[PDB]
Short mmCIF file of C-alpha atoms in Angstrom, two decimals:
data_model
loop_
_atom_site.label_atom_id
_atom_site.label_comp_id
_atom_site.label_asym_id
_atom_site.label_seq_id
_atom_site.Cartn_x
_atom_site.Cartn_y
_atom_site.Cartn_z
CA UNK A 1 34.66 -15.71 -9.02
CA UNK A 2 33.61 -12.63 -7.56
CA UNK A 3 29.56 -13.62 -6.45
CA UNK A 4 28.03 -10.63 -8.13
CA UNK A 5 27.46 -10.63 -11.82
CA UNK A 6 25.92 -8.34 -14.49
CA UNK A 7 23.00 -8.76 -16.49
CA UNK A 8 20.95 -5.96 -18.96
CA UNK A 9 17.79 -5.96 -19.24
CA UNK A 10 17.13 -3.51 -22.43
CA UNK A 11 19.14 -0.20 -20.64
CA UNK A 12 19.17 -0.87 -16.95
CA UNK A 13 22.19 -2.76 -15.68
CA UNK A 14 21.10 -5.00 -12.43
CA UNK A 15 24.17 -6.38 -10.53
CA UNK A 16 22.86 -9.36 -8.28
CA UNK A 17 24.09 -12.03 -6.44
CA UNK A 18 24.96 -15.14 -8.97
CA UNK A 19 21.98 -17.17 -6.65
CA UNK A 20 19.74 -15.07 -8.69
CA UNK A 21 19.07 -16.05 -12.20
CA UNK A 22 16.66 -15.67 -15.59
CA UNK A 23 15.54 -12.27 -14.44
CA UNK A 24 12.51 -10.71 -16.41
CA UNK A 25 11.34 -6.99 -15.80
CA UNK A 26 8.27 -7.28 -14.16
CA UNK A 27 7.50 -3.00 -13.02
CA UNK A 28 8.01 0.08 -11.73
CA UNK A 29 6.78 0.07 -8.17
CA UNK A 30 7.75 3.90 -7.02
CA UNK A 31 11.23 4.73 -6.47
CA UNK A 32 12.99 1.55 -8.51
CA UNK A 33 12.49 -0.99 -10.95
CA UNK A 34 11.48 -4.56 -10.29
CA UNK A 35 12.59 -7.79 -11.95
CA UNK A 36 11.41 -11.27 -11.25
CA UNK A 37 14.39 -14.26 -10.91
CA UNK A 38 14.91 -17.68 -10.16
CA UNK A 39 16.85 -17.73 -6.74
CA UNK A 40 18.75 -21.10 -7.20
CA UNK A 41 20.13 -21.94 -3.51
CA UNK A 42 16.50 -21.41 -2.32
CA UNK A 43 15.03 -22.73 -5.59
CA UNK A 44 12.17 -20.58 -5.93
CA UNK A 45 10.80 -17.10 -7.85
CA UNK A 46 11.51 -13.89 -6.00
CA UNK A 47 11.33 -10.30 -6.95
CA UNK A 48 14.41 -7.87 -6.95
CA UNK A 49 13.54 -4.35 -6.61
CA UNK A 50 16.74 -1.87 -7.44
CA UNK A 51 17.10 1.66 -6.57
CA UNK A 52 20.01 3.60 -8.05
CA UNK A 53 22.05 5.91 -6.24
CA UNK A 54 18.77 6.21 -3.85
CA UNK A 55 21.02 9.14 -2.17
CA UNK A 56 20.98 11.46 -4.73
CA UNK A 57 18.55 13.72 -3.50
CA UNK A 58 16.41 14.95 -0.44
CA UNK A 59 13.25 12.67 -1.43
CA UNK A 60 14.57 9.83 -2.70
CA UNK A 61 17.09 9.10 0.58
CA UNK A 62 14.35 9.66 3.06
CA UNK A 63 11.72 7.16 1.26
CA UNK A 64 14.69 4.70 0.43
CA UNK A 65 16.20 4.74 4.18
CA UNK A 66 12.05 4.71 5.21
CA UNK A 67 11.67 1.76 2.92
CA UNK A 68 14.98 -0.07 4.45
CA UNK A 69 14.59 0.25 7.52
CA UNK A 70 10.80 -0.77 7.97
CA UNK A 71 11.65 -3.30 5.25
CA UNK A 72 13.63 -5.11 8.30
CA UNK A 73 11.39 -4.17 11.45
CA UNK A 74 7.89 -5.27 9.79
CA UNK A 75 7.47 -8.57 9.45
CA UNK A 76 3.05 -10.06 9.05
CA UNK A 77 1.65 -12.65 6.96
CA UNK A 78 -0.37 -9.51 4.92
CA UNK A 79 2.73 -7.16 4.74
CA UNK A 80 5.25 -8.44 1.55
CA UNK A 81 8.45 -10.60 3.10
CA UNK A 82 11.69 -9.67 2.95
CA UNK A 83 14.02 -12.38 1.59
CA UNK A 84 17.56 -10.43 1.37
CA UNK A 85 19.16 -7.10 1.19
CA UNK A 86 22.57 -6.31 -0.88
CA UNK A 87 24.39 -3.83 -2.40
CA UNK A 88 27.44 -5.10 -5.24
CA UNK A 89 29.93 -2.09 -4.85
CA UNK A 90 32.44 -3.12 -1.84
CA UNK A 91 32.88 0.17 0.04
CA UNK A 92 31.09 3.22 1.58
CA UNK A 93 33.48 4.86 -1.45
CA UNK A 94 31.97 3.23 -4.00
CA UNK A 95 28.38 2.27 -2.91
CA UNK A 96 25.75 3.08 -5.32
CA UNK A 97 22.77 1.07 -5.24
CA UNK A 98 20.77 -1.13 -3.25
CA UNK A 99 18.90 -4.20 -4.19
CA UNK A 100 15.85 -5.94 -2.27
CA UNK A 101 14.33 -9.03 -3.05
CA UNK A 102 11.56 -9.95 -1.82
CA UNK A 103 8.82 -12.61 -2.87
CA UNK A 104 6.70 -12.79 -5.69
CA UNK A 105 3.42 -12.38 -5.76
CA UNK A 106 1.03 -13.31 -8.35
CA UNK A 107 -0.79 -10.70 -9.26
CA UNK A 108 -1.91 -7.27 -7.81
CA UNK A 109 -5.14 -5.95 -7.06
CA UNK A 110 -5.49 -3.95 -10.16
CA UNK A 111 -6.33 -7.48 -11.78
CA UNK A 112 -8.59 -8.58 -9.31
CA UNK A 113 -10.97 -5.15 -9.41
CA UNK A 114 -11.51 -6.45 -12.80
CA UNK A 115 -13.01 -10.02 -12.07
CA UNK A 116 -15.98 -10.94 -10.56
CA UNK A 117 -15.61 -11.69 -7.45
CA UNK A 118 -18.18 -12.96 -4.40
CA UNK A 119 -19.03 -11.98 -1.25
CA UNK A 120 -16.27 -14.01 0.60
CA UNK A 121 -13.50 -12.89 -1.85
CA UNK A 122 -14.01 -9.23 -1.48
CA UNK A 123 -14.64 -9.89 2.11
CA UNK A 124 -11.86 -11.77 3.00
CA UNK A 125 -9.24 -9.59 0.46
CA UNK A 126 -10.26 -6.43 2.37
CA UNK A 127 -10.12 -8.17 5.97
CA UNK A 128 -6.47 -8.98 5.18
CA UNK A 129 -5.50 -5.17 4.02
CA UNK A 130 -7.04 -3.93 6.72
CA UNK A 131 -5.50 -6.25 9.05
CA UNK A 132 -2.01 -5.42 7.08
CA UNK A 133 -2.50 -1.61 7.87
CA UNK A 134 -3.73 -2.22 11.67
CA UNK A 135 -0.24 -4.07 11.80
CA UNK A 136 1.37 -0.98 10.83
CA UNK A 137 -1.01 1.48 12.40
CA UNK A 138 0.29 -0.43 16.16
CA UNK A 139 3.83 1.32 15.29
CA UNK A 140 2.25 4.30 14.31
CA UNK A 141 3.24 4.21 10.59
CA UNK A 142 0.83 5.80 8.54
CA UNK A 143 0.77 4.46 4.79
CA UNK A 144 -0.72 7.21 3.09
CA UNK A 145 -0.16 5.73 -0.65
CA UNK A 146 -2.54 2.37 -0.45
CA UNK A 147 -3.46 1.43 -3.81
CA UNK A 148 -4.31 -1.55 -6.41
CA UNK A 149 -0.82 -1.24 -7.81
CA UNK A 150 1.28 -1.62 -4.07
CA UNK A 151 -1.45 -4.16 -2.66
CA UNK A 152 -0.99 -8.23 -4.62
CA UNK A 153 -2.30 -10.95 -4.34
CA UNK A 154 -1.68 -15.15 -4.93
CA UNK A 155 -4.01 -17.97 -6.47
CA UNK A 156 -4.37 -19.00 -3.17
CA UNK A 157 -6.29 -15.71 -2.09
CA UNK A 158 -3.62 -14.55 0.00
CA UNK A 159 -2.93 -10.61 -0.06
CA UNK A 160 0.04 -8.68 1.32
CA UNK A 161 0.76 -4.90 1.11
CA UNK A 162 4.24 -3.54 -0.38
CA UNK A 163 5.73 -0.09 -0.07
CA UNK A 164 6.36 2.37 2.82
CA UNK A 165 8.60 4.76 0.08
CA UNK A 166 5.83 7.06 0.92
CA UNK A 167 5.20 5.56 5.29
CA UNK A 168 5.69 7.60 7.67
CA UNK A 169 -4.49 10.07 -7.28
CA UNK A 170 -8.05 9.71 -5.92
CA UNK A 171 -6.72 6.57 -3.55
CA UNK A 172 -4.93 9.30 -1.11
CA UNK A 173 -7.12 10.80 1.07
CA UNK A 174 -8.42 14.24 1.05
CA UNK A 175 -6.62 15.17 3.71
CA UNK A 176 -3.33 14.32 2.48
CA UNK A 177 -3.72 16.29 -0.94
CA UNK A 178 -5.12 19.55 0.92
CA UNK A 179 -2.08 19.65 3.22
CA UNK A 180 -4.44 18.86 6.44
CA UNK A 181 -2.84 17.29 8.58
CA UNK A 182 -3.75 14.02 9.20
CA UNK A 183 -4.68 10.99 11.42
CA UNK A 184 -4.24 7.17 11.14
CA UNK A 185 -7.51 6.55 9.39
CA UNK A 186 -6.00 8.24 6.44
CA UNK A 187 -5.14 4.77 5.22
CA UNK A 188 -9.18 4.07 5.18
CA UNK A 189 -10.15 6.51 3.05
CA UNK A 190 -7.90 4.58 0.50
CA UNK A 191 -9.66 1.32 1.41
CA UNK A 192 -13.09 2.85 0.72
CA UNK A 193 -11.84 3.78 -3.13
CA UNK A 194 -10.48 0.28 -3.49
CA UNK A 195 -13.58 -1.22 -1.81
CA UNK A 196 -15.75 0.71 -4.20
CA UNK A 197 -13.55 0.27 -7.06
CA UNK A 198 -13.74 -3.67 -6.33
CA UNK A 199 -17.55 -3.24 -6.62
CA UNK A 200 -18.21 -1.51 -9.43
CA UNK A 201 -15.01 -3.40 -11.68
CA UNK A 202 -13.20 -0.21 -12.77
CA UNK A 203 -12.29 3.23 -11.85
CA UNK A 204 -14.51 5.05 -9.34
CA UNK A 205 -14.06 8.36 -9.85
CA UNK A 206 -13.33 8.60 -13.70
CA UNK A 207 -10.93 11.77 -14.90
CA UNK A 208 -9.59 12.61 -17.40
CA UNK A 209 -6.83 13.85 -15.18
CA UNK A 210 -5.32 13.77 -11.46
CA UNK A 211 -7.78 16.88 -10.67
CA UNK A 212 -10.77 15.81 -12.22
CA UNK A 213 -10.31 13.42 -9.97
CA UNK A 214 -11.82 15.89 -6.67
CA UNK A 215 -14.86 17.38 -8.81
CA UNK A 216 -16.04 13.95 -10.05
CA UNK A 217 -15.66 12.68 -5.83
CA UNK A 218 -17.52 15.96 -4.34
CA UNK A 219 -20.22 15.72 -7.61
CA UNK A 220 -20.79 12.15 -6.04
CA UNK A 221 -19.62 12.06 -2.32
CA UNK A 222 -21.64 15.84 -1.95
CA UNK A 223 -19.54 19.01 -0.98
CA UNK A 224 -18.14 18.35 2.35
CA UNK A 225 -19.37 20.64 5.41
CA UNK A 226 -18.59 24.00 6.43
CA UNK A 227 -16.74 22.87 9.55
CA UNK A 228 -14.88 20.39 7.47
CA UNK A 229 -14.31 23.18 5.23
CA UNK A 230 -13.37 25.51 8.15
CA UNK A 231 -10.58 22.93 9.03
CA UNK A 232 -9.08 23.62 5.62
CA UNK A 233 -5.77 26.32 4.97
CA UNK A 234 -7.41 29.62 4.17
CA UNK A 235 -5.83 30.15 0.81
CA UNK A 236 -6.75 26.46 -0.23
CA UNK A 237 -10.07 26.99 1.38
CA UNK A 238 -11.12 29.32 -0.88
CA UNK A 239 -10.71 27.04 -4.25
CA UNK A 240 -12.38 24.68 -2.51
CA UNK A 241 -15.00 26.42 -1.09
CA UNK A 242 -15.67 27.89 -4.85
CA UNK A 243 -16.59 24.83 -6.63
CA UNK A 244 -20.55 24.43 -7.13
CA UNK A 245 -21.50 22.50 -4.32
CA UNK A 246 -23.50 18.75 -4.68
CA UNK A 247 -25.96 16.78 -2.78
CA UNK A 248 -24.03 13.78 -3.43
CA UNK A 249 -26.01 10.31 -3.75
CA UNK A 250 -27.11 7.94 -1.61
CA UNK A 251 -24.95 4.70 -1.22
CA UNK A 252 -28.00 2.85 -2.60
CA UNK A 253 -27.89 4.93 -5.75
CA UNK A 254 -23.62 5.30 -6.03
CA UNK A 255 -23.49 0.97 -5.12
CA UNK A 256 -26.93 -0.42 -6.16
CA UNK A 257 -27.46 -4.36 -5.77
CA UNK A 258 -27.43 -4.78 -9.55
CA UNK A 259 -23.51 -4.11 -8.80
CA UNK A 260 -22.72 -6.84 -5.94
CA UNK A 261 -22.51 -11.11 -6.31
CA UNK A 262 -25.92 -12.77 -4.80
CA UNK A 263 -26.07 -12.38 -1.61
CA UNK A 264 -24.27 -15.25 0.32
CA UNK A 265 -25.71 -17.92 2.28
CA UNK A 266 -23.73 -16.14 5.50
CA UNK A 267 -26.05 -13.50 7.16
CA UNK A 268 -23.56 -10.71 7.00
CA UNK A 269 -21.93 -11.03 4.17
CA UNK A 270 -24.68 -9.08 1.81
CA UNK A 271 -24.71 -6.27 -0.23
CA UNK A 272 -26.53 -4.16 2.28
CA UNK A 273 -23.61 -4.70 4.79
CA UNK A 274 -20.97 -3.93 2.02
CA UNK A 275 -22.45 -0.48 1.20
CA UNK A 276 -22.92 0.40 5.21
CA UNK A 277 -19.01 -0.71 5.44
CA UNK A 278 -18.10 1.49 2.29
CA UNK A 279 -20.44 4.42 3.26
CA UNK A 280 -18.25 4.38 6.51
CA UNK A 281 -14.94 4.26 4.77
CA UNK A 282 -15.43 6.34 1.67
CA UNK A 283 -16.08 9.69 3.57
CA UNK A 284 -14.10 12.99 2.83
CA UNK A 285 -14.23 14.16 6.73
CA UNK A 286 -11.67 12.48 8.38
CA UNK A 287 -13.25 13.04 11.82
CA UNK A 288 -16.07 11.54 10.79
CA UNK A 289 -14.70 8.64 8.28
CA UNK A 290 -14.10 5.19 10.64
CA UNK A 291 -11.10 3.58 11.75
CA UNK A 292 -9.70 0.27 11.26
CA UNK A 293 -10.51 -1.00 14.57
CA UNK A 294 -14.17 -0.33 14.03
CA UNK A 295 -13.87 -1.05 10.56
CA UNK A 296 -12.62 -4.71 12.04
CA UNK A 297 -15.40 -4.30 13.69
CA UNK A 298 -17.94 -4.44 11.02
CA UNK A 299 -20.55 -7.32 10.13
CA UNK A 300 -18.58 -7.58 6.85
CA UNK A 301 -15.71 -7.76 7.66
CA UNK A 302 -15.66 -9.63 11.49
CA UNK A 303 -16.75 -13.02 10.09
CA UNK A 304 -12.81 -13.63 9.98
CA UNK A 305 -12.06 -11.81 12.41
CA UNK A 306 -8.55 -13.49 14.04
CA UNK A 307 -6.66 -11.96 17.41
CA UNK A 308 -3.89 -13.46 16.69
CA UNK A 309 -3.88 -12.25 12.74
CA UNK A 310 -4.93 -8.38 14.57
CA UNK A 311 -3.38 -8.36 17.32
CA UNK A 312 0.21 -9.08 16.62
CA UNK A 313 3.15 -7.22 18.69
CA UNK A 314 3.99 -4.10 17.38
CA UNK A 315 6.77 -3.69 14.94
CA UNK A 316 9.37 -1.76 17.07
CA UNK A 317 11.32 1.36 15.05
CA UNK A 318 14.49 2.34 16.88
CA UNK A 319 12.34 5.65 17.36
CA UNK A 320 15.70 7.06 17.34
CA UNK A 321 14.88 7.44 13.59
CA UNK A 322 11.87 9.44 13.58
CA UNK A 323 13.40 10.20 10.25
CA UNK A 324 11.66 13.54 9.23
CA UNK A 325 15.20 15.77 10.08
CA UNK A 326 16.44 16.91 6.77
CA UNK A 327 20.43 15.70 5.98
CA UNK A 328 22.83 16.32 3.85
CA UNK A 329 23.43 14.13 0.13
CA UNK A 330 26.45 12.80 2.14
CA UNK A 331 25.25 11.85 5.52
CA UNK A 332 22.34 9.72 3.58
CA UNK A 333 24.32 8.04 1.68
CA UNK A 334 26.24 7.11 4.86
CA UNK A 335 22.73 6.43 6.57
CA UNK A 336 21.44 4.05 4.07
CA UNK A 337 25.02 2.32 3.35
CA UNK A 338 24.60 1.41 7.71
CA UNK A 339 21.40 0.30 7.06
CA UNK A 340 22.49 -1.88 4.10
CA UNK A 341 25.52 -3.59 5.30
CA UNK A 342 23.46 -4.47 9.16
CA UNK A 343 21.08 -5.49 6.94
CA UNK A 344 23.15 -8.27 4.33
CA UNK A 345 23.48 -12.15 5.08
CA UNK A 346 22.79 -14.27 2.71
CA UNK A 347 24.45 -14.63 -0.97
CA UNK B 1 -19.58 -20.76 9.92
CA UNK B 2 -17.62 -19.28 6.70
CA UNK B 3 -14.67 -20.70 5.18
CA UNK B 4 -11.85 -18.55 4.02
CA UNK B 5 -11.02 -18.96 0.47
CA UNK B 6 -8.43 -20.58 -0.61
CA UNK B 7 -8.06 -20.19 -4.60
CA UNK B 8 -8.54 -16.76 -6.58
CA UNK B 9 -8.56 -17.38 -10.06
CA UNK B 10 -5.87 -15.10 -11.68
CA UNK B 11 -5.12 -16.69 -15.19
#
């Protein structure tokens, strides 16, 4: 009849088009829910991410319209696909929420930090994020939010990044939570946790809590320099620069061998090339922390090294958005209802 | 010289 239909899953209503079947829940990925369906004109599992009235407010609208319209403009085998875009209510009036399906992955890399991987796994799964971010990076979006739970994974050891809600705790970089200002190689810092956190199976810098997070990084990392600490805003300076300050430890004693597969049979993938890579990446001074050209660059990582993969054409943003001019509850929704309707086609 | 993988065990 009317090529939407209604289906609850415990108290969330989603409202999808009828090619989209059996849905299960399957998270929470930021700013929406996700279910899993059937999609039976292309006969194959997607995932359906809805966000509800994404207009209501300030934060939401900017991340949602940030989320839509990159959604469209990004498109690299290591970046998630975009399959369709649709909203159910038939009218600027009556618009409400979007839906975005997308495929479905198998897993993400939460899973996979807590299996044992070798050399050529970790190697290869941290060549494709980084060639995901570089991807973004050539536009100048800056991901600032990389972590196991927005980075997944296939059987088939493929890996694609989802999410720029936040593209413009530990995983962010320093930077970021001390209101620094900030560069591209934000997005490495993030990669240096993960890296790490691949290594040793589990949490890197264990809390308990969101804050416990810094003291448990500087007790290990070592107290950043006075320079670095220089950079910082005076007021937050001074909690910062209270702290009792660390040596740190080595990379040899924070990522021993005990910790790494055997050594591989390829020259450069070993565990002494791993902890030069992460004691590059996992580095609280941005100015000194590497970027993901050299970081591409690395013994570890360059065995699979692709031009073609890296060097892709830039996305292009109609620039025209540059996005970060606050607007009003009504304009948004006016904003993102545009950017739905040029986006639907296909039902 | 090294092949990309091409299964990751996820069961």
């Amino acid at each position: 009849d009317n090529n939407f239909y209604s289906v609850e899953i415990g108290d969330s209503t989603f409202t999808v088009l009828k090619r989209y079947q059996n849905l299960k829940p399957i998270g929470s990925g930021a700013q929406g829910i996700v279910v899993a369906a059937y999609d039976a004109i292309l006969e194959r599992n997607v995932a359906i991410k809805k966000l509800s009235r994404p207009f209501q407010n300030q934060t939401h609208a900017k991340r949602a319209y940030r989320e839509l319209v990159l959604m469209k403009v990004v498109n690299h085998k290591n970046i998630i696909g975009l399959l369709n875009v649709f909203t159910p209510q038939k009218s600027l009036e009556e618009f409400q929420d979007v839906y975005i399906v997308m495929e479905l992955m198998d897993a993400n890399l939460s899973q996979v930090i807590q299996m044992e991987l070798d050399h050529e796994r970790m190697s290869y799964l941290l060549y494709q994020m980084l060639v995901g971010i570089k991807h973004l990076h050539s536009a100048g979006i800056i991901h600032r939010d990389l972590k196991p739970s927005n980075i997944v994974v296939k059987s088939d050891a493929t890996l694609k990044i989802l999410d720029f809600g936040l593209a413009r705790r530990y995983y962010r970089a320093p930077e970021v939570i001390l209101g620094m200002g900030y560069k591209e190689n934000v997005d490495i810092w993030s990669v240096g946790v993960i890296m790490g956190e691949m290594i040793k199976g589990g949490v890197l810098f264990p809390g308990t809590d969101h804050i416990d997070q810094w003291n448990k990084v500087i007790e290990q990392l070592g107290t950043p320099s006075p320079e670095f600490m220089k950079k910082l805003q005076p007021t937050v300076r001074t909690y910062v620069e209270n702290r009792p300050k660390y040596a740190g430890y080595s990379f040899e004693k924070l990522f021993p061998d005990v910790l790494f597969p055997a050594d591989s049979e390829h020259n450069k993938l070993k565990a002494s090339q791993a902890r030069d890579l992460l004691s590059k990446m996992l580095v609280i001074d941005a100015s000194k922390r590497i970027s993901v050209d050299e970081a591409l660059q690395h013994p570890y990582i360059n065995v699979w090294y692709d031009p073609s993969e890296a060097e892709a054409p830039p996305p292009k943003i109609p620039d025209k958005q540059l996005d970060e001019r606050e607007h009003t509850i009504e304009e948004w929704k006016e904003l993102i209802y545009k950017e739905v309707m040029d986006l639907e086609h296909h039902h | 010289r090294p092949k990309r993988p091409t299964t990751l065990n996820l069961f």
